[PDB]
Amino acid sequence: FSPADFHXDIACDVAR
Amino acid sequence: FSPADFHXDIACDVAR
Amino acid sequence: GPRSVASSKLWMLEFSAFLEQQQDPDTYNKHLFVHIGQSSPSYSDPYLEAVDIRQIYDKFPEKKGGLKDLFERGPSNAFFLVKFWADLNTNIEDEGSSFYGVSSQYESPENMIITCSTKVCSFGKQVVEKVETEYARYENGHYSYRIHRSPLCEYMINFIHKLKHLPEKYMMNSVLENFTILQVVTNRDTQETLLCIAYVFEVSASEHGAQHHIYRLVKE
Amino acid sequence: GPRSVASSKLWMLEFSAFLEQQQDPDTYNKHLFVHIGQSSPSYSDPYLEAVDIRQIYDKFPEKKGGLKDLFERGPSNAFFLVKFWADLNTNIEDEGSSFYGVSSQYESPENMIITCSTKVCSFGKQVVEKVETEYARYENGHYSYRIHRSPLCEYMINFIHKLKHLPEKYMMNSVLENFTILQVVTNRDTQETLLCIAYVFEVSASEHGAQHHIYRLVKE
Ligand SMILES: *C(=O)CCCCCCCCCCCCC
Ligand SMILES: *C(=O)CCCCCCCCCCCCC
């Protein structure tokens, strides 16, 4: 389980 | 069925 | 067509009588008995535009400050009749803690101190009276007012409870044709009647639930 | 003991994030994920009164307008940390129409125009920002403010959905320790920080449900 991957499938395109 | 009796068991003491 | 419960100075956007049951501190179930709002837009009755005030004199408060007295003083455009088809189909009383309340919302072009007086009538006689004073909140150029979760008294709760537990719809309707509410919203400083609404009731038998129509109040 | 999320000028009486499901036009079910109010009075943690701001710098917005920058400008008495134990135990998404929102309520001795800026942070970086402007309503000598049913965006809804469907509490907690919210309430005309709340999260495992503690924010 990766907490970083979990938040990345939500905010990867929003990270600016 | 009496509509008057129905409203009387609610408001009989309130009627002033 | 669409109708707004609105005079030149005040518009009632929302009105709802409800029962809320707390199942646990984070879980709530809410049932609406009657409702006017964005979820229940107001429409006129295609078979009857207006109700003559003489046809309802005997169902509302008489003498000074009564419906007839208020209508004569006017303005005429502040007087409305709402017919509700109440939804009594709920069992939310059974478990958990319950709350019966009524919420309403208003809009005005002006910043006023308003007084809302609500009179419950049984057989034309006043039995309950609740008076609330509200202040404005500026929003998007106009002023908003809200009566948030005003509690129903024990007589209104008892009435609902016994009404819900009647074995027949005809018994519910013969009881409801003798129950009326007269809501008067006033400018506290000028005494002007901003809105006056006479409410009449019937039980709803629609799969869609609670329904309503707005009628103009006239004296012809 | 009891704690109020309040500075010299503004008090947050209520805060709640919720999911409301409309079963039918007259039936609504509401689940609270997090809540602060009369139903959930605020208490301090007997094991920790205050949190040093240096222990959380990396979890919140950095640079101008960030947490550290804001705290330094003060007033110190407007800065708080809330730890929530969120209740994710609901299946109200499954049927009917859903609404995710957040509601909050405030009180002030003064009549101000307030600005509420809410920043959602993932791994210390700002991902969502919602800004709301509110006006006062005079009530019982003070001024009341309300952010009523502010909608959650699709990223917050998606986050909740995936979080709820994790097979383990440890996975929910390792996700939640990287999720923070920074709420800043400002006087729009004077720019004074009226309240600044840093929120941290964990999953609740209590039969009582959602829980919270209020911590003072300090720099020692
Ligand atoms: C204080 O008494 C509150 C105001 C009294 C009633 C307000 C409106 C109640 C609406 C009736 C609910 C439906 C009953 C069939
Ligand atoms: C606009 O984006 C609205 C504000 C963003 C979130 C406000 C607070 C959300 C509370 C979190 C719910 C519980 C999640 C575990």
Strand order in the sheet with D125-135: D50-52, D211-218, D79-86, D193-203, D179-187, D113-122, D125-135
Q: Would residue C5 count as lying in a domain?
A: no
> Best substitution site from D15, D103, D120, D162 to test ligand 2's pocket, by max atoms within 8 Å of Cβ?
D120
Give the residues surrounding ligand 2 with Cβ less than 6 Å away: D 17, 33-34, 86, 102, 118, 120, 128, 130, 150, 152-153, 156, 160, 181, 201
Asked if D129 and D66 touch (Cβ cutoff 8 Å), the reply is no
Count of domains forming chain C: 1
Euclidean distance between CA atoms A2 and D161, whole angstroms = 17
Name the closest ligand to CA D119: 2
Q: Would residue C6 count as lying in a domain?
A: no
Of A10, D29, D208, D217, nearest to C21 by C-alpha is D29
Burial class (CB in 10 A: 0-12, 13-18, 19+), C122: buried
The DSSP result for D67-95, as a single string, is HHHHHHHS-GGGEEEEEEEE-----TTSS
Quote the tokens at residue D107: 């009180």
- The CATH number covering residue D206 comes to 2.70.50.80
Asked if C105 and C116 touch (Cβ cutoff 8 Å), the reply is no
Contact A11 D175 (CB under 8 A): no
Quote the tokens at residue D220: 């020692």
Q: How far is residue D116 from each of residues D58, D106, D142, measured CA to CA in Å?
A: 22, 11, 19
The amino acid sitting at D173 is: N
Residue found under tokens 């609105």 = C6
Identify the closest residue of chain D to C21 by CA–CA distance. D29
Q: Would residue D143 count as lying in a domain?
A: yes
Q: Would residue D5 count as lying in a domain?
A: no
Of C122, C116, C124, nearest to C146 by C-alpha is C116
Q: CB distance from C137 to chain B under 8 Å?
A: no
Q: What DSSP designation does C76 have?
A: G
Q: What DSSP designation does C177 have?
A: T
Residue found under tokens 């006087």 = D187
Q: Would residue C4 count as lying in a domain?
A: no
The amino acid sitting at D36 is: I
Euclidean distance between CA atoms D95 and D23, whole angstroms = 7
Euclidean distance between CA atoms D23 and D25, whole angstroms = 7
Q: What DSSP designation does C123 have?
A: T
State the sign of the Cα–Cα–Cα–Cα dihedral D87, D93, D96, D101.
Answer: positive
Euclidean distance between CA atoms C99 and D7, whole angstroms = 32
Q: How far is residue C123 from each of residues C11, C34, C59, C163, measured CA to CA in Å?
A: 29, 21, 6, 16
CB atoms within 10 A of CB D201: 22
Distance of CA D103 to the CA centre of its chain: 9
Burial class (CB in 10 A: 0-12, 13-18, 19+), D40: buried
Q: Per this entry, what is the length of chain C?
A: 220
Q: Would residue D1 count as lying in a domain?
A: no
Q: Which residues does D135 contact at the CB level (< 8 Å), separation at least 6?
A: C137, C138, C139, D113, D145
Q: Would residue D2 count as lying in a domain?
A: no
Q: Would residue D53 count as lying in a domain?
A: yes
The DSSP bridge partners found for residue C82 are: C199, C214
Identify the closest residue of chain C to B16 by CA–CA distance. C127
Q: Which residues does D54 contact at the CB level (< 8 Å), separation at least 6?
A: D219
Euclidean distance between CA atoms C108 and C145, whole angstroms = 8
Quote the tokens at residue D17: 């994030």
Q: Which helix (H) or strand (E) holds C155?
A: helix C154-164
Q: Which residues does D188 contact at the CB level (< 8 Å), separation at least 6?
A: D112, D113, D114, D115, D133
Quote the tokens at residue C122: 């049984």
Of D43, D34, D2, nearest to D16 by C-alpha is D34
Euclidean distance between CA atoms C92 and D32, whole angstroms = 19
CB atoms within 10 A of CB C141: 6
Q: CB distance from C122 to chain B under 8 Å?
A: yes
Distance of CA D164 to the CA centre of its chain: 19
Asked if C67 and C60 touch (Cβ cutoff 8 Å), the reply is yes
Ligand 1 contact via C33 beta carbon (within 6 Å): yes
Domain span including residue C106: 11-218
Asked if D45 and D213 touch (Cβ cutoff 8 Å), the reply is yes
Chain breaks in chain D (C to N over 2.5 A) after: none
